[PDB]
Amino acid sequence: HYTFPKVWANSGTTADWQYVRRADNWQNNGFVDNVNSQQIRCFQSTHSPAQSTLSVAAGTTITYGAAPSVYHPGPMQFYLARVPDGQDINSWTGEGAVWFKIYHEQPTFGSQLTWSSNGKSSFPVKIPSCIKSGSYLLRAEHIGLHVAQSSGAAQFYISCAQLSITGGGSTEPGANYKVSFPGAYKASDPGILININYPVPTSYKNPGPSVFTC
Ligand SMILES: [Cu+2]
């Protein structure tokens, strides 16, 4: 149980839900367990814009905050989606096959799976240098897998930040990189329907598309 209420760059912290669309778990710190819900995208059944949009240079690392620290086992993953030219980010929900993955977490494989996200209160998110400047949504998710051996038991903790990415390049992620939310995930996916406990897995297939790099 945690939210992802903040993102920041190089000018101190922001306020909760200042640059992050207020997630529907803002009171209970709970999860989405329905990969078919609109909430799987930005945790909003009713779209509501963030108060502001954060300017960040492509190729730099910003910070996505959690509250309180992440403590369920499983991966952090981050996706970007570029708002079309002529559309206002405040109004854009990010529907269709527009999301590309820029990070996913692999566990360390030992007697148990250990996750570097354990105990972390924030995460560095490296924005690709080569993507086109524009307005973007940055989707954060943590997937808690402690009881995920049953369908519908994986716990998704999600939010989305509004960014203005500057100083871009000209690389467009391929069609194979871009997915929709809902759409990208199925309840049967091997990194969602999974017993991480015993026997311990010796590999882990993150859900969603390949990580896009320049
Ligand atoms: Cu919890």
- What tokens were used for 156? 């998704």
Residue 125's SS3 state is strand
CA atoms within 13 A on the CB side of 73: 17
What b/e readout covers 93-115, taking b as 16+ CB neighbours within 10 angstroms?
bbeeebbbbbbbbebeeeeebeb
Q: Which residues contact 64 (CB under 8 A, 6 or more apart)?
A: 4, 6, 7, 78, 122, 123, 125, 138, 140, 161
User: Number of helices (H) and strands (E), helices first, in the chain?
Assistant: 1, 11
Q: Which residues contact 87 (CB under 8 A, 6 or more apart)?
A: none
Ramachandran angles phi, psi of 81, nearest 5°: -140, 130
Distance from residue 185's CA to the centre of ligand 1 (Å)? 20
Q: Rg of the chain's alpha carbons, rounded to an integer?
A: 16
Q: Which residues contact 211 (CB under 8 A, 6 or more apart)?
A: 101, 102, 103, 104
* Residue 58, beta-bridge partner list: none
Which chain residues have CB less than 5 Å from ligand 1, an ion?
Answer: 1
Method: X-ray
Other CB atoms within 10 Å distance of the CB of residue 146 = 14
Distance from residue 28's CA to the centre of ligand 1 (Å)? 10
Q: Which residues contact 30 (CB under 8 A, 6 or more apart)?
A: 1
DSSP 40: H
Distance from residue 71's CA to the centre of ligand 1 (Å)? 8
Cα 208 to Cα 15, 77, 177, 189, 193: the distances in Å are: 30, 9, 9, 9, 13
d(CA 95, CA 100): 13
Distance from residue 184's CA to the centre of ligand 1 (Å)? 23
Catalogue all structural domains in the chain, each as residue range(s) with its CATH number.
Answer: 1-214 (2.70.50.70)
Distance from residue 23's CA to the centre of ligand 1 (Å)? 15
**Cis upstream peptide for 182 (omega within 30°):** yes
- What tokens were used for 127? 């924005």
Ramachandran angles phi, psi of 58, nearest 5°: -55, 140
Task: Tell me the Ramachandran region of residue 163: left when phi exceeds 0, alpha when psi lies from -120 to 50, beta otherwise.
Answer: beta
57 and 166 Cβ atoms separated by less than 8 Å: yes
Task: Tell me the Ramachandran region of residue 147: left when phi exceeds 0, alpha when psi lies from -120 to 50, beta otherwise.
Answer: alpha
Strands 113-114, 122-126: pairing kind = unpaired
29 and 3 Cβ atoms separated by less than 8 Å: yes
Q: Which residues contact 93 (CB under 8 A, 6 or more apart)?
A: 41, 42, 47
38 and 27 Cβ atoms separated by less than 8 Å: no
d(CA 64, CA 99): 18
